[PDB]
From TrEMBL, chain B:
Species for this entry: Bacillus subtilis
Official protein name in the record: Uncharacterized protein
């Protein structure tokens, strides 16, 4: 405790009552002539110490520091995700125990936990004659951690796995679990450091926090105070020079990550560190977003010009795609929008995404791999692809990503509804190259072929089907009418009754030649043809036939309402899209004189049918809950509607304001 | 690969009657808070003919890694006062805060002074006659 | 957070704790002093307790005891004349000022008057608040307060008491008619600072031509010094917002002299009002909206030309940032 070694790499004296041995070291480091006077053995020791200090990042004393360009480099194949290089090193031979200690960590990363446990057990035995306590201590701790991981995974796979998977795969044999339970009983990790020789307890005191409750114990408490300080500095409107309270958090987090990954410690894959990384990354993202919208100061504009020390890079991308679940990124996106906070080093991010796509492609070659590896890798691959929309990709790399996304990518967790969202997010940052549209066409062709057997119902967690892919293709490119998908439209008989409806919903890319077979079997219903046909086109307007087709629906739902209107019950029809026609009255989509008769059945029906005549004191916020673009523009075209809608939005903003009521408001009304 | 860029600012705290440099340190944070207060200051219509624009202004500064002058230490140790501060931050600017007040508080660390709490706060004082809270000078980039 | 929403319990032991702190401060600082090693570890708690006691409902006697120690015995090293008023206002506003405390603020004012007998003693604040703020706080609750001892000390001045004269002039509404006449015979509006103090006191309702001439002289000399300074990079940042007040007067048409149009370029908030049509628009700091009086906000919103860009600026500051006041001034006063 004679010195403080700050995270920026500057040493500052603390007590040092004797002759300063640290400042005298930097004196010799700076002046080459003074280093000559040392003896030969002392000169070699000086060179070895200089190499160690330069590698660890120690720079110089606090006073004679000036501008510091701190750099961070994590040299670990496990961190970067080089799975193939890890497998090559695992399959090769071990020169010494120092290679086995890394091979065990590579095995743990790959998911082969039993082999890693056995290798650690071997290393504990083969590390006696070598007489280095660091390897034995770290092997004991890593074996304990891997045993904890196995016993935790057993509680999940033998628990919810009846519904999580269905096959109920148990990757751990019942005999291996018993062996590890016998061996690991009464381990008492807390009593592992005290049992070692007194020389070890003094030479390697820094390692005491691993085999202890101190593992990320003081770090979490110290991060709490830093988070409070950083949040306070963003509300009082204050500036920070030098090592800010947030730069300390970044440097400290990248210190822990480097120490854990470069030493092959398995404890980097647990909860106490996962929460720490999540909190650190969330705080850093919030602080970076705050800077972009800073308030101009009377003197602070010139008083502090740069004010920036953060920029999201490849390391941030990997730490966000590996430690952030999809849900967490989902809440983060709506609150903080990183679309203006661009990510740099996009070549490395492109390589990382290409590697993820390659892994997801290979792993369906057998699709019977290690279950723990699949469970740990699908989440990371389900977040990097969700996160690539903020990164400008390139040609022939994005092609492979859209390949793997719209191909052998596990359907049990990336069903077509979420797949379309992933694809659209990826295409948002890009401009949809021609090859990408071809790949989407191939996915559409195979998906159409798949449901030809009996049904292949498009079960989707979201309310988005295969038709949305073609809809997006035409919305971004209204020229995709290629012959190949039409080769199954009218070249096949119109008696399947399931392909018929699928080409009905995929109609906008289908021509009349295909129509002669596909639309032939299909007919017109009450509003079912409108709900399916004109919803995607092929009419696009209320044709003269529709002028009487809507007549049936307008009176069917009218009598359905009247049945409970003359008595009063809940037997009103749940098909409330009759309001849509009323809604279509407002946005110049219904011009019928008989619609003045249906007014009075629906509280919002006369609301939309009567753009000005409707009593707007009856106006209710619920009519705007589920809403779209042209109606938004249609308040903007009706001043009286706008007058009452702004009032109700303001009352909501004062009464119940949570997120969306101003969201509707600011985009229009002014 | 991530690289962090960290700038620095040099603060000189000295006396008024002389140029006796009390000490020099770095810069940590600066808070310029200008705002108004509760309705007690201005209640009803009151001064209807003329607008009075109340402006409560505070200028706080925090400093770390401060060492005291040897000559000043010797003079003051061997047996009210108004001081000043000068910044030399980087272009480079010349921030001058005249008539600052050094606040502070004593903290006792369990680990014999873990980080040794070397934080000193200054608050700018505004007198009824004086008005130049801070003077900024611009030099070559 | 919002600590005012938090409701406190046991408001009889908290009151005893605060009264004990006040008794400790009074006992130690009424004597020779406090132990230096004990002063270090007690004053930080006393300041925090007396600052946090704004959310506690105290009785008349306890409030009197606490105020008599927050004003007299609390050392000036910790609580200056500004923070002292800021801390006393929290206690005063949360109660109805039982009339026992006003007599203590009056004693504090008379003590400051006695202190002002020397020429070289000037109050040093940190927020911009002085004894005149105490005088206005006293008037906010009691409407007349024809002071006895203040009037008596006022009726003792001479031509060689200009500092005492200034201090008593800053507390004009608390003086009696005889003291008012005696002081006003001893001094008159002759400076920008004196003009400001006159408006704050409530004397100059209408600006006579002499006041306009003095303001024009102030603006001309400010322009001269600005032109002198611009040869170098020196740009002074003052603490008196006279330029902003002049622009607010011009915008409200409280003055009718067009020569203010010449002095454009000296400030940014000034040109925002003197020449709103030719303001640079994104030299506009949005925080100016947080200081203007509600009538000033309404009149700014009345001007549609200004409104067109102010609405965009406020929308940008609301959607990106997060503050209640910004959206409030947006939706009530603006569109």
């Amino acid at each position: 405790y004679d010195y403080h070694f700050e995270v920026n790499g500057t040493v500052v004296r603390h007590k040092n009552k004797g002759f300063g041995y640290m400042e005298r070291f930097f004196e010799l480091k700076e002046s080459c002539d003074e280093r000559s006077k040392l003896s030969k053995k002392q000169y070699e020791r000086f060179n070895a110490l200089f190499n160690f200090f330069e590698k660890n990042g120690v720079i110089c004393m606090a006073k004679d520091a000036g501008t510091l360009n701190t750099s961070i480099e994590i040299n670990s194949l496990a961190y970067h995700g080089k799975y193939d290089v890890m497998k090559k090193f695992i399959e090769e031979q071990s020169v010494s125990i120092e290679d086995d200690y890394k091979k065990a960590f590579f095995l743990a990363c790959l998911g082969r936990w039993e082999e890693s446990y056995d290798l650690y057990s071997n290393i504990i035995l083969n590390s006696i004659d070598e007489s280095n306590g660091c390897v034995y201590y770290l092997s004991q701790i890593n074996r304990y951690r891997i045993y904890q991981s196995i016993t935790q995974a057993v509680t999940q796979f033998n628990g919810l796995g009846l519904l999580t998977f269905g096959r109920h795969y148990k990757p751990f044999t019942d005999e291996f679990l018993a062996r590890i339970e016998r061996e690991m009983t009464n381990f008492n990790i807390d009593d592992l450091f005290n049992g070692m020789p007194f020389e070890f307890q003094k030479k390697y005191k820094i390692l005491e926090f691993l085999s202890d409750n101190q593992f990320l114990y003081d770090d979490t408490v110290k991060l709490f105070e830093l988070t409070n300080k950083v949040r306070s500095e963003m509300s009082e409107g204050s500036y920070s020079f030098g090592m800010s309270s947030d730069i300390v958090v970044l440097l400290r987090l990248y210190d822990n990550l480097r120490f854990l990954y470069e030493n092959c410690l398995w404890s980097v894959s647990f909860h106490e560190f996962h929460q720490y990384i999540r909190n650190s990354m969330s705080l850093l993202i919030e602080k970076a977003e705050y800077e972009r919208t800073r308030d101009i100061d009377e003197l602070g504009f010139s008083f502090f010009g740069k004010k920036s020390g953060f920029f999201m890079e490849y390391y941030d991308f990997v730490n966000i795609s590996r430690h952030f679940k999809i849900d967490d990124i989902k809440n983060l996106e709506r609150s903080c929008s990183i679309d203006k906070i661009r990510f740099g080093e996009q070549e490395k991010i492109e390589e990382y995404l290409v590697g993820i796509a390659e892994e997801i492609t290979k792993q369906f070659s057998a699709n019977g791999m290690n279950v723990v590896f699949y469970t740990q890798f699908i989440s990371e691959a389900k977040a990097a692809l969700y996160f690539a929309k903020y990164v400008k990709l390139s040609e022939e790399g994005l092609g492979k990503i859209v390949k793997a996304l719209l191909f052998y990518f596990p359907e049990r967790d990336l069903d077509i509804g979420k797949r379309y969202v992933w694809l659209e997010r990826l295409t948002k940052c890009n401009e949809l190259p021609k090859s990408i549209i071809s790949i989407i066409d191939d996915f559409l062709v195979l998906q159409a072929e798949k449901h030809i057997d009996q049904n292949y119902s498009e079960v989707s967690s979201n309310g988005l089907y295969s038709r949305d892919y073609g809809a997006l293709i035409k919305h971004f490119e209204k020229n995709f009418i290629s012959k190949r998908l039409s080769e199954i439209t009218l070249c096949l008989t119109q008696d399947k009754q399931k392909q018929i409806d699928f080409l009905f919903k995929l109609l906008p890319l289908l021509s009349t030649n295909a129509k002669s077979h596909l639309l032939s079997f299909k007919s017109v219903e009450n509003i079912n043809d409108l709900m399916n046909g004109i919803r995607i086109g092929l009419i696009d307007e209320f044709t003269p036939e529709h002028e009487e087709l809507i007549i049936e629906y307008l009176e069917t739902r009218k009598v359905n309402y009247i049945v409970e209107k003359e008595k009063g019950i809940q037997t009103f029809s749940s098909n409330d899209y009759m309001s849509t026609f009323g809604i279509w009255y407002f946005l110049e989509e219904i011009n019928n004189s008989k619609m003045e008769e249906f007014i009075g059945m629906d509280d919002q029906y006369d609301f939309f049918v009567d753009p000005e005549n409707f009593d707007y004191k009856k106006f209710i916020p619920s009519w705007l809950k589920n809403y779209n673009d042209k109606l938004l523009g249609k308040i903007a075209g009706n001043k009286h509607m706008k007058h009452h809608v702004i009032e109700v939005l303001k009352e909501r903003v004062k009464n119940s304001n949570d997120k969306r009521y101003l969201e509707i408001l600011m985009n229009y009304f002014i | 690969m991530k690289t962090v860029i960290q700038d620095t600012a040099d603060v000189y705290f000295k006396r008024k009657s002389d140029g006796k440099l009390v000490f020099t340190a770095e810069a940590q944070t600066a808070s310029f808070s200008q705002a108004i207060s509760e309705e007690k200051l201005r209640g009803g219509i009151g001064n209807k003919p003329l607008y009075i624009l109340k402006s409560e202004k505070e200028i706080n500064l925090t400093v770390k890694n401060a060492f005291f002058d040897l000559e000043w230490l010797a003079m003051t140790q061997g047996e009210s006062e108004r001081y000043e501060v000068e910044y030399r931050t980087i272009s480079d600017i010349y921030i001058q805060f005249p008539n600052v007040s050094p606040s502070g508080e004593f903290e006792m660390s369990l680990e014999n002074g873990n980080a040794l709490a070397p934080e000193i706060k200054f608050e700018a004082l505004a007198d009824t006659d004086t008005d130049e809270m801070a003077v900024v000078i611009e030099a070559s980039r």
